[PDB]
Amino acid sequence: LLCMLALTFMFMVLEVVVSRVTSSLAMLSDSFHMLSDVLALVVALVAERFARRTHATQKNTFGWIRAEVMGALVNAIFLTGLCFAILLEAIERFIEPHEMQQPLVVLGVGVAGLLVNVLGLCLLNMRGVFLHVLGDALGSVIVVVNALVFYFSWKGCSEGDFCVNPCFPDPCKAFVEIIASVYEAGPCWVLYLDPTLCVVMVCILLYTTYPLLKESALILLQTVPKQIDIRNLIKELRNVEGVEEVHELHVWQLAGSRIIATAHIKCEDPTSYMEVAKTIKDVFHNHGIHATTIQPEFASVVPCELACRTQCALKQCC
Amino acid sequence: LLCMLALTFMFMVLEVVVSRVTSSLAMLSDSFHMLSDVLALVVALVAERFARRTHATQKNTFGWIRAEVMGALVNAIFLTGLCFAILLEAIERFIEPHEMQQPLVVLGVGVAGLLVNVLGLCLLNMRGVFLHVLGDALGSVIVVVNALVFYFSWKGCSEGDFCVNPCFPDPCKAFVEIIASVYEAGPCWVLYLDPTLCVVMVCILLYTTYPLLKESALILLQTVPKQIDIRNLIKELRNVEGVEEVHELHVWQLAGSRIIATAHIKCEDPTSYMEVAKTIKDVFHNHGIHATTIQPEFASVVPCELACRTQCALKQCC
Ligand SMILES: CC(C)CCC[C@@H](C)[C@H]1CC[C@H]2[C@@H]3CC=C4C[C@@H](OC(=O)CCC(=O)O)CC[C@]4(C)[C@H]3CC[C@]12C
Ligand SMILES: CC(C)CCC[C@@H](C)[C@H]1CC[C@H]2[C@@H]3CC=C4C[C@@H](OC(=O)CCC(=O)O)CC[C@]4(C)[C@H]3CC[C@]12C
Ligand SMILES: CC(C)CCC[C@@H](C)[C@H]1CC[C@H]2[C@@H]3CC=C4C[C@@H](OC(=O)CCC(=O)O)CC[C@]4(C)[C@H]3CC[C@]12C
Ligand SMILES: [Zn+2]
Numbered sequence: 192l193l194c195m196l197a198l199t200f201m202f203m204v205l206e207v208v209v210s211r212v213t214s215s216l217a218m219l220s221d222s223f224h225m226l227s228d229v230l231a232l233v234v235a236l237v238a239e240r241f242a243r244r245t246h247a248t249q250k251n252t253f254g255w256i257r258a259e260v261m262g263a264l265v266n267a268i269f270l271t272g273l274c275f276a277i278l279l280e281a282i283e284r285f286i287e288p289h290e291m292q293q294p295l296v297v298l299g300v301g302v303a304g305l306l307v308n309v310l311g312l313c314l315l316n317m318r319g320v321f322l323h324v325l326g327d328a329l330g331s332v333i334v335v336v337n338a339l340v341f342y343f344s345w346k347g348c349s350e351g352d353f354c355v356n357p358c359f360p361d362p363c364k365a366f367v368e369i370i371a372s373v374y375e376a377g378p379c380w381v382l383y384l385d386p387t388l389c390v391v392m393v394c395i396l397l398y399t400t401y402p403l404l405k406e407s408a409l410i411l412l413q414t415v416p417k418q419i420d421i422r423n424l425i426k427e428l429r430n431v432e433g434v435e436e437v438h439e440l441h442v443w444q445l446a447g448s449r450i451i452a453t454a455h456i457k458c459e460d461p462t463s464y465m466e467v468a469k470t471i472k473d474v475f476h477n478h479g480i481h482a483t484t485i486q487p488e489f490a491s492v493v494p495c496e497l498a499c500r501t502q503c504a505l506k507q508c509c
Numbered sequence: 510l511l512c513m514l515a516l517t518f519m520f521m522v523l524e525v526v527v528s529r530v531t532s533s534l535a536m537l538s539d540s541f542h543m544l545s546d547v548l549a550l551v552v553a554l555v556a557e558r559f560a561r562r563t564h565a566t567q568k569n570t571f572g573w574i575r576a577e578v579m580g581a582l583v584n585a586i587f588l589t590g591l592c593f594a595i596l597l598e599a600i601e602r603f604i605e606p607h608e609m610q611q612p613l614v615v616l617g618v619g620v621a622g623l624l625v626n627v628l629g630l631c632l633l634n635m636r637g638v639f640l641h642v643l644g645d646a647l648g649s650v651i652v653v654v655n656a657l658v659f660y661f662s663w664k665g666c667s668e669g670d671f672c673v674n675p676c677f678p679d680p681c682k683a684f685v686e687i688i689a690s691v692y693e694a695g696p697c698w699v700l701y702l703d704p705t706l707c708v709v710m711v712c713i714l715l716y717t718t719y720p721l722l723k724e725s726a727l728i729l730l731q732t733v734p735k736q737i738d739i740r741n742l743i744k745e746l747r748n749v750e751g752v753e754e755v756h757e758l759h760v761w762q763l764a765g766s767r768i769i770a771t772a773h774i775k776c777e778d779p780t781s782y783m784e785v786a787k788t789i790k791d792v793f794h795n796h797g798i799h800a801t802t803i804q805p806e807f808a809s810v811v812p813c814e815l816a817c818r819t820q821c822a823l824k825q826c827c
């Protein structure tokens with residue numbers, strides 16, 4: 192983990208610095224994606240370290256096990272925020288285009304990123320990581336092809352001869368239009384490739400990270416998992432022996448694949464309660480739910496036999 | 510709520526657009542703060558709309574009560590991401606200083622924001638809103654004083670007269686040293702003022718948003734609330750004549766003041782369980798807990814009388 196984490200972090204630092212100095216948007220977006228990747232590795236390591244020894248902690252009774260889910264959510268939404276900022280910068284660049292400072296350094300960092308992804312390729316359990324590395328390499332080669340197209344087409348100028356087309360506003364009024372030799376700059380295919388390509392990059396990043404963010408948000412919010420069917424479960428619970436009807440059923444996913452159930456039941460006879468709670472355990476275990484807790488209300492218009500009279504209707508769940 | 514929402518959103522759009530036009534970072538940070546405020550209002554409205562008709566939906570058995578807290582976390586982390594982008598821009602501006610484009614429009618939008626905050630004042634439950642609007646007004650004061658100081662002190666050349674600037678690199682090297690020696694006034698107190706005020710603004714935003722993010726994170730992660738002491742509660746539960754030992758006790762907060770408790774008690778005398786259950790209800794209602802699902806495991810090699818046959822990968826918590 193750390194063996195690639197350190198390399199990715201150091202490359203991220205240099206990449207961010209040189210990109211924002213050179214002020215090229217697609218490069219900045221690719222560096223932000225590498226930033227999201229390295230923070231994903233960081234949160235994965237933190238979650239593994241915390242989950243290695245989870246117990247009945249004084250502060251957290253359940254344990255810091257939702258750490259991986261919350262880290263995924265934080266990374267996804269942090270990337271979304273940075274991507275929104277980058278899109279705002281791209282719109283600003285549409286407002287007033289700027290040329291690339293130096294294609295040579297951009298090509299160098301692009302091939303460096305390509306080599307970084309190639310090295311990471313060597314290091315679906317591993318196929319998912321390989322696909323993520325391939326997507327990062329795709330972003331890197333998009334940066335590289337941007338650099339190539341800019342270098343091959345943008346003839347530009349480096350002398351005092353009239354070179355800048357009216358599309359690009361002249362710097363410092365071009366010395367009041369020199370108060371020289373006639374020259375025409377590059378065609379209308381550059382000075383716009385960088386932002387019109389960074390928008391594609393940011394759109395693809397948003398499309399890739401939306402399902403992960405949605406899944407993490409649904410996990411963090413108390414939502415029944417798609418695997419468990421609430422209607423089938425409630426109907427099958429009603430169709431048991433010794434139980435009249437069930438209420439206050441709460442089912443939610445904690446993290447990964449450990450589901451917690453909660454319900455209240457009523458039994459006709461207090462005697463011989465066992466072999467009935469065993470039936471409830473078996474029927475819950477039949478579905479994906481494994482950790483349960485069933486409170487019996489022993490045997491009428493009142494919904495639940497156990498309710499504090501002086502209770503904030505709200506405070507009491509549902 | 511929407512009456513101020515529409516005005517705030519329209520002003521946010523205008524200020525963001527004009528700030529990106531003029532490239533002023535302090536105004537950009539203030540606009541980001543306004544964006545955070547309007548998004549907070551939006552999430553509050555949607556949370557109230559969802560909470561007005563909270564029901565045991567098939568997808569969400571608990572209900573979308575946690576929507577407000579999730580929106581608060583989303584806003585806090587989005588603001589943090591935008592603030593990180595702002596720090597990147599500020600470090601860039603330290604690397605290469607750029608002067609403000611048009612002080613007049615910046616002063617106009619600053620006084621417009623001040624008037625917006627004044628109208629907000631015109632329109633703890635309300636003391637918190639007063640504190641927030643006073644903070645936003647303070648940010649507007651920062652941006653307007655930045656504009657005022659830049660306008661009065663800066664004396665950059667506008668015409669073709671000589672202006673030797675060592676502070677900022679001249680565009681096109683001033684026609685390559687031109688291939689009325691007017692000197693600028695106080696470059697130190699002018700060029701660097703905007704990025705440093707932006708850094709101060711973003712630092713104060715981080716300081717004022719960190720506690721909210723921490724509380725929201727502790728709410729989403731299943732953490733015992735600071736109001737309830739878990740050790741005292743378990744000691745009182747153990748100090749009950751009916752129950753022998755209490756195991757698998759989980760306490761967590763849903764949203765606001767809604768605490769749900771879970772326990773696996775073991776007791777004898779099946780015909781008198783309800784006598785114990787009333788005592789458990791009373792002792793839980795003594796603390797902040799108001800919703801419990803105490804499951805009696807009726808009668809020490811095995812800790813819990815009910816358990817999965819395989820308990821694969823100990824999905825069941827603890
Ligand atoms: C790319 C940008 C967003 C910077 C990311 C930096 C991370 C490496 C930082 C940000 C938040 C940090 C965490 C914030 C809080 C804590 C709790 C801390 O536990 C304590 O000792 C708590 C002490 C207390 O507050 O009482 C251990 C480090 C940790 C996990 C930090 C680990 C390092 C983190 C993830
Ligand atoms: C071009 C500029 C102005 C940026 C535009 C941003 C949004 C208009 C885009 C970015 C990502 C898009 C989302 C990417 C993915 C999806 C999932 C897609 O299908 C699903 O909901 C689930 C698909 C699946 O998982 O198979 C519906 C459209 C949606 C929400 C897209 C809606 C439009 C979004 C938010
Ligand atoms: C501007 C850039 C370059 C640096 C930004 C640094 C911030 C992320 C740091 C600087 C000072 C820090 C604060 C210094 C002191 C505290 C008090 C302390 O918070 C509490 O009060 C929690 C404990 C309590 O319950 O009293 C720890 C977090 C906090 C807000 C820190 C949060 C992180 C801050 C804002
Ligand atoms: Zn990646």
Ligand SMILES: [Zn+2]
Binds near residue numbers: 818
């Ligand atoms: Zn099971």
Ligand SMILES: [Zn+2]
Binds near residue numbers: 495
């Ligand atoms: Zn009940």
Ligand SMILES: [Zn+2]
Binds near residue numbers: 501502794798799800
């Ligand atoms: Zn109560």
Ligand SMILES: [Zn+2]
Binds near residue numbers: 509
């Ligand atoms: Zn309930």
Ligand SMILES: [Zn+2]
Binds near residue numbers: 542546644645
């Ligand atoms: Zn505000």
Ligand SMILES: [Zn+2]
Binds near residue numbers: 773774806812
């Ligand atoms: Zn038990």
Ligand SMILES: [Zn+2]
Binds near residue numbers: 757758759827
């Ligand atoms: Zn447990």
